Amino acid sequence: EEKWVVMVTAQTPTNIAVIKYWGKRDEVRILPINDSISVTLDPDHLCTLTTVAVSPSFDRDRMWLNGKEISLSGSRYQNCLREIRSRADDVEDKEKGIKIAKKDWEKLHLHIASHNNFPTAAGLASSAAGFACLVFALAKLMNVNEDPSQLSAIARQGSGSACRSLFGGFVKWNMGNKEDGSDSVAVQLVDDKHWDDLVIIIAVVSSRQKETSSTSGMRESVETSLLLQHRAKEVVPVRILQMEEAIKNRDFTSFTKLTCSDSNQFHAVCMDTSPPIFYMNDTSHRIISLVEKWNRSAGTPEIAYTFDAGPNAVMIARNRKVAVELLQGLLYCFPPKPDTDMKSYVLGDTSIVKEPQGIKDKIGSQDQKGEVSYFICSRPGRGPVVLQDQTQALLHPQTGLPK
Amino acid sequence: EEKWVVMVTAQTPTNIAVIKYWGKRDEVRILPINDSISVTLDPDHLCTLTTVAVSPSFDRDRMWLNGKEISLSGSRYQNCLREIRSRADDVEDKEKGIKIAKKDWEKLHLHIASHNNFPTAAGLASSAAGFACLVFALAKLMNVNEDPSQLSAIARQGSGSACRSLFGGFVKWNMGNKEDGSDSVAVQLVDDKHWDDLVIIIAVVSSRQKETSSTSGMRESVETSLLLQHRAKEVVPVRILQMEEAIKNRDFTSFTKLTCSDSNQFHAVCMDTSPPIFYMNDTSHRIISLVEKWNRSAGTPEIAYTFDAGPNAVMIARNRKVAVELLQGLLYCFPPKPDTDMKSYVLGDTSIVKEPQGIKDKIGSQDQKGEVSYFICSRPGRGPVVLQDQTQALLHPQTGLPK
Ligand SMILES: C[C@@](O)(CCOP(=O)(O)OP(=O)(O)O)CC(=O)O
Ligand SMILES: C[C@@](O)(CCOP(=O)(O)OP(=O)(O)O)CC(=O)O
């Protein structure tokens, strides 16, 4: 048998919902009970990088995540692979003498290696950027003839939030109304330049509490929370329309009202679940109080917050001057562990990190030390991209096994 | 002018809602948006003791709470005084030569002194037992001809939860539907003997966070929480009927499902408020996790929890053997501050306090020290009573001023 190896490497950003996805109506096709809207983040310290490879000499589909092999046996990987394979087409690399016929893909096995630049015990959705990257890279590999919105639908079957990482900027996942899920897809609302002033600051919060997974948790809520249905039918459709308008016109005050309140309502549904799900901790509450105080002592709002399925705070600053104030604010309230290199305790961006009483005004009181593990600054970012520089591939170009 | 002094002293227990009151439809008459149901606790370490006095020589209405004079100027005191005075009748103490004509009450001023046996910075509703006691004692003083249910309605105007402390046992506050509030009253569901097996354990949790008041908080929720209306119209009416049946038939499993879930849903509405209200802290969550684990590792439920407008946990044990296990459980997970007299760290009851691996089974892991300030054990209790023993009066029988 032949031993050529075709591979593709892609880099895919993560995203952060400002109007939240919580609860499915279909556990197999992954269709949600409401729309959601998110912001794609800049790749640095947040993206997932993935290399996919096909060879007639691979005996098995196999996958590696951050160095360790893992199972593709599960339904989420099995459904993406199946859907993308079924759309594979003729490929031909003439320089290398390789012709793959459409039918060949029914038997060619795949090797996938993937790397998450978010620290793994830090707590950010690895799944979102990850299934989006897999789908996007495989779609290049197999010459699938489909736009990002249709590819959205495949990524969605690996993880619901993954479908929103196929575009940059601000992205809407439409819940769709067809049974087959074909219209449950993401679409870009605006690109990453429309609102380039926003700066994002993630507080990765210390906690050893292991968090109920988003998939199980939201299933539990659909099954036991008597408030979720009312959220889904009567609250979120309206919030979707207001958030669209707020993004269109960069109304940061409307954007702040919506983001904070939809995050809080999502955590309210989690508390109304039986047994209750507690994703925020006392540090989380302390960050919200800081943000709400800071905004009251500045009249018009300067900072929004949102929280996913954990205590990590995501803060969104109206612009860079706010970001610089806030970052000194946050360092006062969340001083580090003793002997801590500030190069390690505040990742991202560079210019803002390199940069005071009038701030003590807006925050008030200092906290105990080390409630925060570290901060990450970022920005709205573009969508996924292919990497042509093979130095960045994670599979060996000849063995098809992890470097 | 004359200088006789007529006084009455009464002792009134506090109560604990298992189906929660949260939100008014009338801020003046204090009418709620849903029914509520509570359990009256045994008086020890929980009651409020009040002495009321009238004399022609008092120039002013005045009141003392735990030693300190306070203002009666506010609407809550002004509305109770006004309502009870308007129902005053002819009084006559023949031994002392005192005749009070109905009309005299329009001019006689009152002295009130009151004492809360809950520590004041501990965090229990002083208001509930307090306005109930005031109304109950004044109703005796002024010879009002009204049953506890009608007196309920007056206490309600001092504090909504106060109306439920006019009966022992399990008590329902009916939301009523008349504009004048006359049918918004409490009624006893069963007395304190019907379910005498229940043991109650209150964890008074350490926290310096000052809590948003119940009155302001629930106003904020009515104004900003989009889930509250659905709770009030569609969740609670059904829970009221199930909780009635569960109390009637001492179904502790149904009672546990309802109590935990209605407490959690109340805190969910608080989180859905803008700005959010956080009454539970990380200690609170740790107690819920202990209770949920303990119940799973015992099959049928043995312990219910509920939380009011603060982090204090109220636990309700199916019976005394459970209570004794749990209390050793709680001491393992919440060890005291160093050098702490266990006579001070666990109040109440006596027999159960005086009373182990097989329990390590049900709780798991130990916590840091001093997360709990102290525990209080109690039981379902009777309603308010008059004290005839003048040694217990808080006003001096001749000056009408605080001892
Ligand atoms: C709380 C959220 O982050 C939900 C994340 O859900 P997942 O995308 O992880 O769930 P599955 O579809 O089961 O894979 C809010 C959001 O991203 O919208
Ligand atoms: C959370 C609760 O304890 C509400 C207490 O409310 P208050 O009775 O204190 O409020 P006001 O009527 O304004 O005086 C739940 C309950 O007791 O039902």
UniProtKB/Swiss-Prot annotation, chains A, B:
Major localization class: other
Keywords assigned: ATP-binding, Lipid biosynthesis, Lipid metabolism, Lyase, Nucleotide-binding, Peroxisome, Steroid biosynthesis, Steroid metabolism, Sterol biosynthesis, Sterol metabolism
Gene disruption: observed consequences: Decreased contents of campesterol and sitosterol (by 50% and 30%, respectively, compared with wild type). Decreased emissions of beta-caryophyllene (by 35% compared with wild-type).
GO molecular function terms listed in the Swiss-Prot or TrEMBL record: ATP binding; diphosphomevalonate decarboxylase activity; identical protein binding
A cellular component annotation (GO) from this entry: peroxisome
One Pfam family matching this protein: MDD_C
Binding-site list for (R)-5-diphosphomevalonate: Y21, W22, G23, K24, R76, S159, G160, S161, A162, C163, R164, T215
E.C. numbers: 4.1.1.33
UniProt cross-references to InterPro entries, sorted A to Z: GHMP_kinase_C_sf (IPR036554), Mev_decarb (IPR005935), Mev_diP_decarb (IPR029765), MVD-like_N (IPR053859), Mvd1_C (IPR041431), Ribosomal_Su5_D2-typ_SF (IPR020568), Ribsml_uS5_D2-typ_fold_subgr (IPR014721)
Single biological process term from Gene Ontology: isopentenyl diphosphate biosynthetic process, mevalonate pathway
The keyword Ligase is annotated on this UniProt entry: no
Pathway terms, separated by semicolons: Isoprenoid biosynthesis; isopentenyl diphosphate biosynthesis via mevalonate pathway; isopentenyl diphosphate from (R)-mevalonate: step 3/3
Protein origin, superkingdom: Eukaryota
Protein localization: Peroxisome
Annotated catalysed reactions: (R)-5-diphosphomevalonate + ATP = isopentenyl diphosphate + ADP + phosphate + CO2
Residue span of motif Peroxisomal targeting signal PTS2: 38-46
NCBIfam families: mevDPdecarb (TIGR01240)
Quaternary structure and interacting proteins, as annotated: Homodimer.
Stated role: Performs the first committed step in the biosynthesis of isoprene-containing compounds such as sterols and terpenoids. Is specific for (R)-5-diphosphomevalonate (MVAPP). The catalytic efficiency with (R)-5-phosphomevalonate (MVAP) as substrate is 10000-fold lower than for MVAPP. Can complement a yeast mutant defective in MVD activity.
Protein name in UniProt: Diphosphomevalonate decarboxylase MVD1, peroxisomal
Species of origin: Arabidopsis thaliana
